[PDB]
């Protein structure tokens, strides 16, 4: 059903902002972890979705393959995203920049805004910039939850254009506890060619 994609970049491509280590634990391991565990939850009628279509379907899913798939297919769809939004000052322009200057104010309160997100979720979790009604918005959910999922499910909706991994596992071999710093870093490896296209596709 599912598989794990191929990074577009090599595992170092990152550097010195995430460590290649990581990139490959990240990557071959936990990700890979996620795509197995989903794939056995779905071993069922559901198995034919793309998982960014079956997360917008779990209160339909047996009440017995909802927090599996929550957790594994909310994984898959989040570091499939998570890949592709990074690539090796960094800013989007055209009308991501204009979106994001009414929306925020300016691409560094966004930034901000989008950090303290990042900051406040407690424990395990992902800060997205999302769409909303046509609107951006910056929100965070709780382990793999996406917004895609619901209100119900996440604790916010929209559409995700750009997420950030604050899993410890995503920073703790190059930041340890600093993930502030991890967070700073992050801004030298956004795509924001691809964001811009994923903006387009969703407003
Ligand atoms: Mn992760």
Redesign the pocket.
Same mark, same amino acid.
């Given at each position: 059903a599912y598989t794990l994609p191929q990074l577009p970049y090599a595992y170092d491509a990152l550097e010195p902002h995430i460590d290649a280590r990581t990139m490959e634990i +990240?990557h071959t391991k936990?990700?890979q972890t996620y795509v197995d565990n989903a794939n056995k939850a779905l071993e069922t009628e559901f198995a034919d979705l793309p998982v960014e279509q079956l997360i917008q379907q779990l209160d339909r899913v047996p009440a017995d393959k909802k927090g599996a798939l929550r957790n594994n297919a909310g994984?898959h769809a989040? +570091?499939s995203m998570?890949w592709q939004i990074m690539g090796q000052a960094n800013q989007p322009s055209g009308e991501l920049l204009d979106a994001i200057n009414s929306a925020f104010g300016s691409f560094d309160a966004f930034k901000q805004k989008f950090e303290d997100a990042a900051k406040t979720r407690f424990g395990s979790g992902?800060a997205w910039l999302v769409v909303k009604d046509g609107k951006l918005d910056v929100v965070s959910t709780a382990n793999?939850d996406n917004p895609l999922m619901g209100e119900a499910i996440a604790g916010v909706s929209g559409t995700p254009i750009l997420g950030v991994?604050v899993?410890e596992?995503?920073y703790y071999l190059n930041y340890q506890n600093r993930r502030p710093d991890y967070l700073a870093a992050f801004w030298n490896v956004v795509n924001w060619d691809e964001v811009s296209k994923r903006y387009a596709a969703a407003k």
């Open positions: +990240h936990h990700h994984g989040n +570091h998570f992902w793999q991994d899993w596992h995503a």
